[PDB]
Structure formats: structure tokens, C-alpha cells
Design a protein around this nucleic acid. Sequence first.
DNA 1: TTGACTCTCTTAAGAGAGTCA
DNA 2: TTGACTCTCTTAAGAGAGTCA
Lengths: 162, 162
Amino acid sequence: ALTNAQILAVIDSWEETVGQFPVITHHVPLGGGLQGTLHCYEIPLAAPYGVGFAKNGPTRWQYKRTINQVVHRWGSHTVPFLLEPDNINGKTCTASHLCHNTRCHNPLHLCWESLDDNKGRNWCPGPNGGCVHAVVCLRQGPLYGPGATVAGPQQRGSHFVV
Amino acid sequence: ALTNAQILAVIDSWEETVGQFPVITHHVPLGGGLQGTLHCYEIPLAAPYGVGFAKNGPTRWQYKRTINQVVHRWGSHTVPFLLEPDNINGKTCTASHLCHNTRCHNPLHLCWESLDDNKGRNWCPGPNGGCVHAVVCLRQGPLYGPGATVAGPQQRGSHFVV
DNA sequence: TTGACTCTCTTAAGAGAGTCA
DNA sequence: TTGACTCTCTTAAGAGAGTCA
Ligand code: NA
Ligand code: NA
Ligand SMILES: [Zn+2]
Ligand SMILES: [Zn+2]
Ligand SMILES: [Zn+2]
Ligand SMILES: [Zn+2]
């Protein structure tokens, strides 16, 4: 098994490569009517992506390193968290984009949490709008708001009470 | 089936049958430290479920009726909305449980909205904790809270900024 | 050892349709 | 006609593993 020192070297090589990705400045809602700025380090749209990186799906990538003749591979956003517990409360940990920008690999825009926690950030009011996430959101979730409900609760007769 | 009259008859027979499901009281968080009471009309756990109903999955059911010698079948929670547009902004409309209780078929606990709007209610703070859903939530979402994030954003080197 | 592709899978909110009696 | 089962699919947040040169 890879030693903790070998893992740190993988994280360091990953950071060095991602750090050279194009850095894109995005203006984002923070909640409470305030605007902020996030700086995303975006993997390219097509090959080559960077040393060690390859695309396994339309918005999925993996990082690969060969150590002592053994090929090791990880989901491309999971590498910052290789020295962390990989589950919590019986749930698998997932890389969660605080910036909601899938191509971004900035580790300052990622956290490591259950898929439910991950998904829920899509609807968070944001760090200036009432976010209660203990690891705070960086921005208001892209799906926050009144929604677009087509039809509400209703009955034709009188069979039901709320 | 095709005619508005036929559709209304389908909705009316569905309401009559669901109206005879056991009524189960559930006390629920509303947000803001307040509690409310919902009355769910719960489909039985095992057959027989009711005239027209059959289970197609662990928590999936379908309603079916024979109209002009032809069988018509719908997802069991979609029947209240048969007269509504089946899509919004190019997204499929889905039956959305305001009570977060899949067995419940109370149409006063259902709305008709995109799957994204549907999912997002799981994390809503609730009608007394800041819900902004235009069709208001009946309760705080079951997944609302600080989360259980294992690791937050971090970097080892000095290549990234927020 | 490396790049650039290929494939299928997980989850939890939701769906459609066929086989029998 | 009605009931009670069976199967796979959709979405958008996420994954692991194989092939070839
Ligand atoms: Na996410
Ligand atoms: Na729902
Ligand atoms: Zn980012
Ligand atoms: Zn948040
Ligand atoms: Zn209910
Ligand atoms: Zn709400």
C-alpha cells in the first residue's frame, strides 16, 4: 500500500498540475443580494488535460500515477482528500464543488462530504443569505429561489384535509 | 384518457379510492423551532392497495383504469395533475411530496414541478424557517441542517486562491 | 509509465412498460 | 376487467475499471 508520504507526493503533483489550469474569474451571488468573486482552475474541454489527467465521462475525469510499477487511479476531484476518512455516518464521502463548477479542480473550492450533503448545496441561500452548513458555502446555490412549480396542492372533492 | 370528462373521472375515482387510505398523523418540524401536524393518506404496505393501484417498486405505485376497453396507466402520484402541462422550461414535471412521505397520496401534500425543484425541498428550512418556495413547503426538509462534512477546502502548497 | 479513449456503476428524488392469473 | 407481480429507465450530483500502443 502507498505510504502516507507517497500519498502526500501524489497530492503535491496533483496541485502542481491543477495550479497550471486556466484560472477563470467568476462573479457569483453570495446571498442577501451581495455579489462575490470565485477563481476557478478549470480543466480543459478536450485533450490534453494536463499531466496525469484523462476524461472518463462528459464531465468526469480521473488522475493516474504509476508508483513502483503499480498503476493507481483516483477520481480527479478526490485527490485533495486522500488522507481523510472516506465515509461518515455510514455514507460514502464525495468531492463536493462549493463553486458549483464541475470542470473546476481548485481544492479551495472542494469539500468532502456525503452525496446528500453535496447535493443540498445546490439550494443553499449562501454565506450571506443564511447558510447553516458547518463547512460554509462559498456562494448561493444555483438552484436557490422560489422555484417554478406548475401546479400546487389541490383536490376536486372534499375527501382530504391537510 | 383523451377527453377532459374522462380525465376528470379518472381524478375523481382516484381521489375517492385514496380518500379511503388510512389517515396517519405526522408531527413535523416547520422551521423556526415550531412544529405542525400533517395528515397523510398512506397507501398500504402490501397488496391489496386499493381499486386501481399496484406496486411496481419498493416505494413506486401505478394507478390504472380501463377506458373504452383500453388500459390507461399512470404513476400513482401523477393523477391529480393530469390536466396540467407535463413539462416546464423543457424539464419533465414530477409529483413532489411536500410531506416527504412516499406512501402518502394526499393530493393536498403534492405539487407538480421539475425534479430539481422537487429534490430541493429536502433541504428547505421550512415554512417557519425561511422557505422561499412560491408554492410553499408544508415542513422543514428532512435533510436541512449543518451537514456532516469530513474535510473542508484545503491546499498543501501556495498555488490556489479562493 | 503515460495518454486518450472505452465501458458500467451509485444515490435518492422521480418514471415507463410487460407477464401472468 | 382487475389484481399482483416482474423488469428497466431518468436526472444530476457523484464513482471504479479496461484497452491499446
Ligand atoms: Na455538488
Ligand atoms: Na420530493
Ligand atoms: Zn471553482
Ligand atoms: Zn450552505
Ligand atoms: Zn402526506
Ligand atoms: Zn420550501
